[PDB]
Structure formats: C-alpha cells, structure tokens
Amino acid sequence: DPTYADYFSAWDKWEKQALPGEERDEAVSRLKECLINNSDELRLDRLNLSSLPDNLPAQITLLNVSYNQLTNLPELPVTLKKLYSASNKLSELPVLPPALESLQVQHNELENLPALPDSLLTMNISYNEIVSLPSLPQALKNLRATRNFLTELPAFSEGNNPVVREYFFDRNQISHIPESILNLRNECSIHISDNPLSSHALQALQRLTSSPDYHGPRIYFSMSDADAVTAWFPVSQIWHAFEHEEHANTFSAFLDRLGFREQVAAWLEKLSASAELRQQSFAVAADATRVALTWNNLRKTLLVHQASEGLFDNDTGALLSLGREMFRLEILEDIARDKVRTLHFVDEIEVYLAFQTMLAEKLQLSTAVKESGVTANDLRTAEAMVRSREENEFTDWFSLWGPWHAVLKRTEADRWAQAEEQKYEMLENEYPQRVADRLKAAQVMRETEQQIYRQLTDEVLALRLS
C-alpha cells in the first residue's frame, strides 16, 4: 500500500531504465494521471514496454498492457475486473485478482494458467503453448483456446439455466472427447476441428449430430482428422525383428499393435530374444478378429512360457497370489465391456485401463501402471462385484488356469498324469450329457474338466511348500 511519493519515485527510476525503442516516458505520464484521479482504467498498450513497474495504481479496475514486450506482469491490483495483456512475450501469469471478469492474454508464450476465479466470464488464451487448464468457473460463458498444446477437452456442466456459451478448442492436440459434452444444451457451441481425434470418436460425433432427434450442443469438427511398425514408438531391432517378419501371421498380428508405453517394450523384451514366446503369441492373438481380452491373453501366453521354465516350482505361493490378481483383471474386463455400451467416444481398452489404475490400490493389482467416463459409483460397484465373484469362482478358475497347468506339467507329475488318465469321463459320460439338455432346452467338455482339475486341485501340489 504505497504512498503517492513512493509511486512517483518508483516510476521515475523505472523510466530512466528505458531500453531504446519503447515509450516508458509516456507510460509514466499515464501512470501519474491515473493516480492523480480516481481513474478505474489504465492503458499502457502499444508502447513496446520491456517491463511494467513493480507497483501499479491499486484502485484500477481495467488494465490494458497489450501489444508490448512484457515477459512478466507485476502483482495485479486486487480490484481488477478486466486485464488485457494480449500480444506480449509472457511466460507466466501472476495470481489473478479474485473479482476478475475478463482475461485476454492471447499471443503470449504461456505454458500454464493460475487458478481462475469464479467471476471469470470470458477468457482468451489462444496462440500460447498451454498444456492443460485449471478447473473452469461456471460463470465462464466464452473461452477461446485456439492453437495451444491441450490434450483434453474440459468436462462442461450444464448450467441450471440456458445461456449462450462458445468454446474454441480448434488447432490443439486434443485426442479424447469426454462423454459429458452431450449433456449440454443446444445453446452451447464446441469447436474441435484440427485436433488429433480418433476416427471412432469422429464417427460417433458424425452419427449422433447427423441424426434428427439430436438436441445436444453444436459440435464443429472435421473427420479429415506392415513390419516396420512395432519397434517404432518404443529404434534398432527393426532390422532384427524383420528376420521374424518373414514368417506367418504378421500382417494382422503386427499391424494390430495399436507407464504402459514403458514396458510394452519390456513385453517386447523377451518376445525379442526367445522365439518360443511369439511362435505362440500370434496363435490366438491374430485369430480373434475386444482387445482387452486379448491383451490379457498374451499376458497369459507370456505367463505360461515362464511357468514352462519353472519359476513357480517351490514358489507356488507367489503363483497363486498372481492368479488372484489376473482373475480380478478378467472380471474388470467384463465390467469394462459392460460400460463401453453406454459410452460413445472410447472403446473397451481405454475404459479397462481406467478401471485397472483407479482400482489398483483398492484391489492390490501390482501388475498395473500407477497413472475417462468412469464415475465413482462404477468404481464402488466394480470392487463389490469382483470381491463377490472372487469368493464364488476363484478356486474353480485357478484350477483351470494355464500358468498353473504348466507348473504341474513340469513340477510334480503323478496327479497331473493321473488327471489326464481319468479321461474315462470324457467318453463314459460325455455322449449322454452332450445334448441331454440342449434338446431339453462342448459346454460339458468344459464342465467335466473343471470337475477333475478342481479334483486334482483338491489334493493339491500347493500343500508341499506350505
């Protein structure tokens, strides 16, 4: 809270530090004139200023410093209602006064925004390098963000009364439309052309907005948006893997390669070295023409070849707890498949991974990265359903599990061989019960081996370590 003389002398010193090519002298006269009166407005635009003084008149409600060479703004007056600072070289904004209604800082070098007050009605942040936004106030009816580095459309809320709202997010890096935009009324307009959007969300946007019986928001968009495919985004072994490219099932088994990116390379890692892995990965990973049930399969095909070696010979305790995780994952996939029915702009794999990471803590899914439309209720129900199906189905499931059948195939025979030798049921009772209720209405070939392998898993090989 400076005194008149402090303002004057601070501005006089600030003037003598003028870089040539700027009108600091004129700004001081406008600053003094602003102080001398009760003036709510201060305009220092188009003077090519290289900086503002530290202390600006504390009572002003409008500040225009557009078209200068500013890299920084000082602490803005708390009574500020409208801040025009377009066409500068700003790297950061200060904290915004709480009563701000308008913010024009387009054509700067901004990477981030401070907290937007609740009073903000209009905002122009276009032609910056912003990567993501804070939560936007509801009073915000006009927002222009053209040509930034945004990755995500913000989830709007339908205000209780309908007012015209316009959002320009064109020429960004947005890749995912949130399901929330269909809540909004027709009085709101969204511009998302020139964004790297999926062709799925494109075709969804096409289908819904190109229907009669559509009362949502006006969304403006443009649908205009073999072997050297695998090692690209993980560099060197593109030639090493080409030796394997001259083989079977590589056109739909490699082109279909659409945190996670880190160890998709560490799953690339041993399929790289050993030919045993994807002599059989491409087995059912190319004839499935849902990609989370497959992604789980190649997890399994990975895990059977390890169990083929014998990592779980005496350590079946850690094999069992891993099947507990992988069972809850394959329940989560069915949760995911159930939800994508109701979502338009995402497919199962994305929803699956949303469930996996948002629940990795609560359900102890170690094999998950610690990073959409998934609410808080479908997280609660997802846990309630996996926990109950776990209680009812895990042991039957683990007895049929692949990795464990492998460690029995390697470690500890007898029972394993005996189990296979009890194939009497597959011919002494398999023809009568074959359609014994298919006409009273291979399903029992899965029901019979369940019985024996669970029976094998009655007098288990796990009661030798414990």
Numbering used by the authors: -1 to 0, 22 to 244, 255 to 263, 270 to 293, 304 to 334, 340 to 421, 428 to 497, 512 to 536
Copied sentences from the primary study:
IpaH9.8 is one of the most well-studied members of the IpaH family and is secreted by Shigella flexneri during infection. IpaH proteins function as E3 ligases and subvert the host UPS pathway to suppress the host inflammasome and innate immune responses. Recently, it has been reported that IpaH9.8 targets human guanylate-binding protein 1 (hGBP1) for ubiquitination and degradation in order to suppress host defense in cells. In this study, we illuminated the key role of the LRR domain in autoinhibition of IpaH9.8 and revealed that IpaH9.8 can be activated by its LRR domain through substrate binding.
The near full-length structure of IpaH9.8 (truncated the N-terminal T3SS signal sequence) was determined by crystallization and X-ray diffraction at a 2.75 Å resolution. The crystals belonged to a space group I222 with one copy of IpaH9.8 in each asymmetric unit. The final refined model of IpaH9.8 consisted of Thr22–Asp244 within the LRR domain, and Ala255–Ser536 within the NEL domain. The LRR domain of IpaH9.8 adopted an expected solenoid-like structure consisting of eight LRR motifs, with both the N-terminus and C-terminus capped by two helices (right). The NEL domain of IpaH9.8 is an all helical-fold structure, consisting of three subdomains: N-subdomain (from α5 to α8), M-subdomain (from α9 to α13), and C-subdomain (from α14 to α17) (left). In our structure, the α8 and α9 in the NEL domain of the IpaH9.8 (termed IpaH9.8NEL-FL) showed a “helix-loop-helix” fold, with the loop region between α8 and α9 being flexible and not observable in electron density map. The autoinhibition mode of IpaH9.8NEL-FL is similar to IpaH3 in mode 2. Structural analysis revealed that Phe395 in the NEL domain makes hydrophobic contact with Ile196 in LRR-CT, which might be important for IpaH9.8 autoinhibition. Further structural analysis revealed that six hydrophobic residues (Ile196, Leu201, Ile211, Leu216, Leu224, and Ile238) located in LRR-CT constitute a hydrophobic cluster. In addition, this hydrophobic cluster forms a hydrophobic pocket in which the Phe395 of NEL could be confined.
